[PDB]
Design a protein around this ligand. Structure first.
Ligand SMILES: [Cl-]
Ligand SMILES: [Cl-]
Ligand SMILES: [Mg+2]
Ligand SMILES: [Mg+2]
Lengths: 224, 10, 224, 10
């Protein structure tokens, strides 16, 4: 119940690879209403990304089977996993909208959280239909675009947060919004403008930047 | 191959 | 609720790497009170071994931290994981004692299940103290020994089930019962008597046997 | 190194 205890236990859960527990601890810590440090926001993101990652992988397997199929068992179990995934995404989005975005006292935090919002709406969009999907896509776009605006004002082009956001927004354009031209435009501009400064970077800086830029290049190769 | 998001290559 | 549906869903859960779900489906199937096929008993074992495996790995991490420590957070969280692990082991053991062992219509099934019983008692023993640990160790030994007796009568020395049982019983002797001489004796006899027939084995047979025999050799090297 | 049980090497 003390915040320090929750953080301590999140760190233990991380070492123990208990990501659902880790997420729950971090949710409790967020709900104390104080900002998260860089270390702490990374605990939050790692935890929830592992949980949703498992659900997303399962959902893709079941959805694929269900499609090739076209009894109710596959559909039923796919729906069970889908509901669970929606639940987790909604939990993360609730933390972002009830605490994290508005309480963030600096631009870097704000970009990190608005990117997270875009990401979790994107994960919802992957499973969504109908009016739900329309609402979700609009919400994802709005979050990502706000994040983009701040990042272009506040961060240099090789900054890993800025690059990761641009990468994920480009994926949104291609995979979710069915806007390949916007996806390609964004990816190319992002890569080109980052490449322009990589010669000024140190060893560890360059690696962090280049790892994300490699994904920008991989995507462009698939999309072209 | 498929579209890759941030963190997918570790 | 129909058995065939539960089996279908266990198979889907396995493809989706949803092991907790897979275990739950298989529990429901066992509770229909019919025997499991070889395929099905392997679904049961894979599911529960993945679930307990995660708990065991987490428990070891937390226990290690707790020991090096010697606030209450590590102890508390270690106890939470321990309780969950005990729960799962108790669930599996309940299936084995309420259905599987007594209902098994052939010797191979009976050995498979009695080995499972030894294994899950062994996992309980790893976290146990006091009178609980004493009871558990006696139960593990009794299950493993009954399995050993049947296997020596009913299976050839390179049979993978027979080898796996002997391997796990030797680990029980060394790690749980603090009986290194019995562990070494059993491992050596098992290896020697299997090695004696490996020249009669086919490619795929030999691999299955040799993979377990490699562990017998690894253990002997550590224990000597 | 540590004691290995059945299935621990895949
Ligand atoms: Cl360069
Ligand atoms: Cl040989
Ligand atoms: Mg739906
Ligand atoms: Mg205890």
């Amino acid at each position: 119940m003390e915040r320090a205890s929750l953080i301590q236990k999140a760190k233990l859960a991380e070492q123990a690879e208990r990501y659902e527990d880790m997420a729950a601890f971090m949710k409790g810590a967020v709900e104390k209403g104080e900002e998260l440090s860089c270390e702490e926001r990374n605990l939050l993101s790692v935890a929830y990304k592992n949980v949703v990652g498992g659900q997303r992988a399962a959902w893709r397997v079941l959805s694929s089977i269900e499609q090739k199929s076209n009894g109710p068992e596959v559909r039923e179990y796919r729906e069970k996993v889908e509901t669970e995934l929606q639940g987790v995404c909604d939990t993360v989005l609730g933390l972002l909208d009830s605490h994290l975005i508005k309480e963030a006292g600096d631009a870097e935090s704000r970009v990190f959280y608005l990117k997270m919002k875009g990401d979790y709406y994107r994960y919802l969009a992957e499973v969504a239909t109908g009016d739900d999907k329309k609402r979700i896509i609009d919400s994802a776009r709005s979050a990502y675009q706000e994040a983009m605006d701040i990042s272009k004002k506040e961060m240099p082009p090789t900054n890993p947060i800025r690059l990761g956001l641009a990468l994920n927004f480009s994926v949104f354009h291609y995979e979710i919004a069915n806007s390949p031209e916007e996806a390609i435009s964004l990816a190319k501009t992002t890569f080109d403008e980052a490449m322009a400064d990589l010669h000024t970077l140190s060893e560890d800086s360059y690696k962090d930047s280049t790892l994300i830029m490699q994904l920008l290049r991989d995507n462009l190769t698939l999309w072209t | 191959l498929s579209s890759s998001s941030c963190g997918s290559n570790s």
